[PDB]
Coordinates of C-alpha atoms and ligand atoms in Angstrom, one line a residue:
X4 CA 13.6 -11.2 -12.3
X5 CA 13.7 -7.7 -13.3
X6 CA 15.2 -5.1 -10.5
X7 CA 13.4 -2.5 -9.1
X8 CA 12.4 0.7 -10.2
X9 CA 12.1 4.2 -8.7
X10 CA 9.9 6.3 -10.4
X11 CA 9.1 10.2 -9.9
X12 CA 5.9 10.7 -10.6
X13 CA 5.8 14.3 -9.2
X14 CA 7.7 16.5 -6.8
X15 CA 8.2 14.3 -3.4
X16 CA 6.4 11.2 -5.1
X17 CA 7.6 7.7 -6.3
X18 CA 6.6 5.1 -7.6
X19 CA 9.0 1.5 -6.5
X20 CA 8.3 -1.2 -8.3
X21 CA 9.5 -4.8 -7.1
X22 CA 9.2 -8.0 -8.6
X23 CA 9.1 -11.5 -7.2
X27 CA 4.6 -22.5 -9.6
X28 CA 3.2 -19.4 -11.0
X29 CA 5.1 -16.9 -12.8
X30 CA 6.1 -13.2 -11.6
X31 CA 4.3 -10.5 -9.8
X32 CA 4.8 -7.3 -10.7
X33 CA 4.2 -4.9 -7.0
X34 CA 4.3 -1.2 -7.0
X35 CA 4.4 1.1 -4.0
X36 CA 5.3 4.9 -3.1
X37 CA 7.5 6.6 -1.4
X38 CA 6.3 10.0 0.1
X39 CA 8.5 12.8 1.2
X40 CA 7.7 15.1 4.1
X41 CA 10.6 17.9 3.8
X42 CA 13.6 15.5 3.6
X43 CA 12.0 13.2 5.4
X44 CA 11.0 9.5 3.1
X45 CA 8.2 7.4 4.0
X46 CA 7.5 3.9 2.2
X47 CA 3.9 3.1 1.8
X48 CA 4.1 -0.6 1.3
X49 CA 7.7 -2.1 1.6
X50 CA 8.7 -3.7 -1.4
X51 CA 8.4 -7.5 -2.4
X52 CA 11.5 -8.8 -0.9
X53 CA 13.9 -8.2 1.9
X54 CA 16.4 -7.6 -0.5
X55 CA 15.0 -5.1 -2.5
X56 CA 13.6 -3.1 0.7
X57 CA 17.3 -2.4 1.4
X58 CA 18.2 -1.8 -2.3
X59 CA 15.6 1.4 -1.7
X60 CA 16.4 2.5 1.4
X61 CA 19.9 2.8 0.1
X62 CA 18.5 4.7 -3.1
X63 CA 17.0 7.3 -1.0
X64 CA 19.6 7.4 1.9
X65 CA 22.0 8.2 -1.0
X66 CA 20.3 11.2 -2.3
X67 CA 20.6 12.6 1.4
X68 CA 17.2 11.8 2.7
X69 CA 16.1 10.5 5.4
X70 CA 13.7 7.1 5.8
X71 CA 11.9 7.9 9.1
X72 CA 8.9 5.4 8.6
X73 CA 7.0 2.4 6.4
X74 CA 3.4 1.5 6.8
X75 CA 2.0 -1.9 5.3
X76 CA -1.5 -1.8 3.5
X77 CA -2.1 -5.4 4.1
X78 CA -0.2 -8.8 5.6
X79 CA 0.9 -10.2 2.4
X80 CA 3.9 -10.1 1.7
X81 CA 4.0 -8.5 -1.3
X82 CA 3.4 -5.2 1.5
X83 CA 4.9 -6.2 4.4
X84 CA 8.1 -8.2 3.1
X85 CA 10.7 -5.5 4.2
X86 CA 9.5 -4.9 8.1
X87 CA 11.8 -7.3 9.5
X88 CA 14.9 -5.9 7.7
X89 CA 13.2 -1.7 8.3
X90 CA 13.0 -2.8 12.6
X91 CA 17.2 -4.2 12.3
X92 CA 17.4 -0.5 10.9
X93 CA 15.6 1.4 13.7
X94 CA 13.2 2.7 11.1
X95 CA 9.5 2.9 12.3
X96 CA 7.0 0.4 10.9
X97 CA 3.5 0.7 10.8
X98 CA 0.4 -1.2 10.5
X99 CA -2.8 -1.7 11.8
X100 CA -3.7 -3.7 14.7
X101 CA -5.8 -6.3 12.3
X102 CA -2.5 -6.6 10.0
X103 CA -0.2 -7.2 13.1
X104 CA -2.5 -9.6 14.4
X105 CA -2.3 -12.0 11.2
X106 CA 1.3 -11.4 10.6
X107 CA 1.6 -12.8 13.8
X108 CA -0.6 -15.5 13.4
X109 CA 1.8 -16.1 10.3
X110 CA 4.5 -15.9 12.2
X111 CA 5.9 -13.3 10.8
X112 CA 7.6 -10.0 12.4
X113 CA 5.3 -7.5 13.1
X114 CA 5.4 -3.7 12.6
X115 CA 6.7 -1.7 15.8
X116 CA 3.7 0.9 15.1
X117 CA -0.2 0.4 15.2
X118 CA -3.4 2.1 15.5
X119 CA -7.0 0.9 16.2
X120 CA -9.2 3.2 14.2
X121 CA -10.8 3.2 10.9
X122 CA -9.1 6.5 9.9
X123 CA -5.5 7.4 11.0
X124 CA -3.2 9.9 10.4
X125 CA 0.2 9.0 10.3
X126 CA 1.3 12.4 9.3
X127 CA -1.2 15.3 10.1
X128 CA -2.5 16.5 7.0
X129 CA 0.2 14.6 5.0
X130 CA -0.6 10.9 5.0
X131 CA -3.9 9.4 6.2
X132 CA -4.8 5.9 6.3
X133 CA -8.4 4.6 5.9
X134 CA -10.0 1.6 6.2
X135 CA -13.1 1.2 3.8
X136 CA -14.0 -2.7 5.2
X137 CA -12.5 -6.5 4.1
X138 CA -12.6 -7.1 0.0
X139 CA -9.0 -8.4 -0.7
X140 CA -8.0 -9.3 2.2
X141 CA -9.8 -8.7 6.0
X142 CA -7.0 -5.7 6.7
X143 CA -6.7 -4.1 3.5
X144 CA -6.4 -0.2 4.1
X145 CA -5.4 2.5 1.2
X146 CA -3.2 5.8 2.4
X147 CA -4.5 8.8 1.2
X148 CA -1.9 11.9 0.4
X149 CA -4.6 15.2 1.2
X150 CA -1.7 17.7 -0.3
X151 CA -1.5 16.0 -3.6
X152 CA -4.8 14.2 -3.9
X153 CA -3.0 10.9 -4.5
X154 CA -4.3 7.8 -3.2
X155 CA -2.8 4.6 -2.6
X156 CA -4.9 1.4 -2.7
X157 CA -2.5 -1.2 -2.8
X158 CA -4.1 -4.4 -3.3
X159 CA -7.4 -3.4 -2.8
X160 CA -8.2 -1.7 -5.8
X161 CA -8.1 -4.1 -8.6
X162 CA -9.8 -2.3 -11.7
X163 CA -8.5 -5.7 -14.3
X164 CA -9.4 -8.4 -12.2
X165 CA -9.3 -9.0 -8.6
X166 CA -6.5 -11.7 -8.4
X167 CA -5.6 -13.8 -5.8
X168 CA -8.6 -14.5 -3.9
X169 CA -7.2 -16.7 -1.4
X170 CA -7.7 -14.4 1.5
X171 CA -10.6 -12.1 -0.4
X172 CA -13.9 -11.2 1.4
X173 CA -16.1 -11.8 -2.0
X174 CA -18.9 -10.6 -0.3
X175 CA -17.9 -7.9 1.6
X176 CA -15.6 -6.1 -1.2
X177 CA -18.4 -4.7 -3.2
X178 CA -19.9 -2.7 -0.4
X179 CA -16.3 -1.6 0.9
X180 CA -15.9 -0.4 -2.8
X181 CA -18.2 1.8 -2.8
X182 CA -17.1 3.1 0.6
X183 CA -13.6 3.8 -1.1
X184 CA -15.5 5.4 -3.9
X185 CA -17.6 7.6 -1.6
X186 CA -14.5 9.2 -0.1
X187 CA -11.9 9.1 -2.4
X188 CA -14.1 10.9 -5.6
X189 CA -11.6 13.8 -5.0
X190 CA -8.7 11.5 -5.9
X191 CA -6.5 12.7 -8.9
X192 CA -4.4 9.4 -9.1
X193 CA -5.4 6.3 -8.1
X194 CA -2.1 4.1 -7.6
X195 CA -2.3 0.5 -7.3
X196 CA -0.3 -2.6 -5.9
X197 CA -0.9 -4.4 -9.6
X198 CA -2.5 -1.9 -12.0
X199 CA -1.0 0.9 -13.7
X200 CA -1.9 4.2 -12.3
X201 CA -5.3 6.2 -13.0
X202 CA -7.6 8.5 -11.7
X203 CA -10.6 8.2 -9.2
X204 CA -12.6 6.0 -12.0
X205 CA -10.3 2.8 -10.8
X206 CA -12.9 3.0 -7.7
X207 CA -15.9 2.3 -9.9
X208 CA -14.0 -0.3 -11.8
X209 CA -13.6 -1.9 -8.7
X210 CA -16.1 -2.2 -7.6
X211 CA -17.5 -2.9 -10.8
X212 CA -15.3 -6.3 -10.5
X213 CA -16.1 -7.0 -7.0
X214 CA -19.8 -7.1 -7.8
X215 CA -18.4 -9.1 -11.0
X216 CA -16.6 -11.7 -8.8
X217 CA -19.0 -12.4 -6.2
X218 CA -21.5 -13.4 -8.5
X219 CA -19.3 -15.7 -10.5
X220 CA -18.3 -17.6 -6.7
Ligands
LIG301 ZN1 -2.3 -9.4 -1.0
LIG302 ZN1 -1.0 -7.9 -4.0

């Protein structure tokens, strides 16, 4: 398995990339800053490799003060148990807690009710545009750099694993995401490489794609 990566992609903006009888998945996530202050969106893949970037940033002086999880799976959520031994907030919404749980799996300390809310005010926002990957799935939008987050929602190639996936609810929810996030510059996802606000349409594009096929 390859180890992770920590990518700048601009000024208080990373990119980590994990990796985890299939094969290997390849998952990339952010890492936001807020002054000093570092906040994972999405934890990495493993345990493991959640601590290998905490570390990372803790080492270059700042400060982890949160986490939130776009979605159950653990390719987003992996790292909580290990963040709440650390004292370091995590965050979900209450639809994500309430199938981690019926996983059995540790839940985030944090979570909120609404479609839209701000974790940070003006900073990070999270929005829910409906079910399409999974039933949780929300993407964290960054207002001050017009960077959006989608995680495993937005799947411009191919929508993937479909073992949890709302075929047809994704292609309306898509078009929800593409409604509000038009004004996105990048468009980062958990399994694509990074674009602009186009990645919407392509999702959508392949939900509509994928729904007929079922
Ligand atoms: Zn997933
Ligand atoms: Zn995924």
């Amino acid at each position: 398995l390859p180890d992770l990566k920590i990518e700048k992609l601009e000024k208080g903006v990373y990119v980590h990339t994990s990796f985890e009888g299939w094969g290997v998945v390849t998952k990339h996530g952010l890492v936001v800053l807020v002054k000093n202050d570092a906040y994972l969106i999405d934890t990495p893949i493993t345990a493991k490799d959640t601590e290998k970037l905490v570390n990372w940033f803790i080492e270059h002086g700042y400060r982890i003060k949160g986490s939130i999880s776009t979605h159950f799976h653990g390719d987003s959520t992996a790292g909580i148990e290990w963040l709440n031994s650390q004292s370091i907030s995590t965050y979900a919404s209450e639809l994500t807690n309430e199938l981690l749980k019926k996983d059995n799996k540790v839940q985030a300390t944090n979570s909120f009710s609404g479609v839209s809310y701000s974790l940070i005010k003006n900073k990070i926002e999270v929005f829910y545009p409906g079910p399409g990957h999974t039933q949780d799935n929300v993407v964290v939008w960054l207002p001050e750099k017009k960077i959006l987050f989608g995680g495993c929602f937005v799947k411009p190639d191919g929508l993937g694993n479909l073992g949890d996936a709302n075929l047809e609810a994704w292609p309306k929810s898509a078009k929800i995401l593409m409604s509000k996030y038009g004004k996105a510059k990048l468009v980062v996802s958990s399994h694509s490489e990074i674009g602009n606000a186009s990645l919407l349409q392509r999702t959508w594009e392949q939900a509509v794609k994928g729904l007929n096929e079922s």
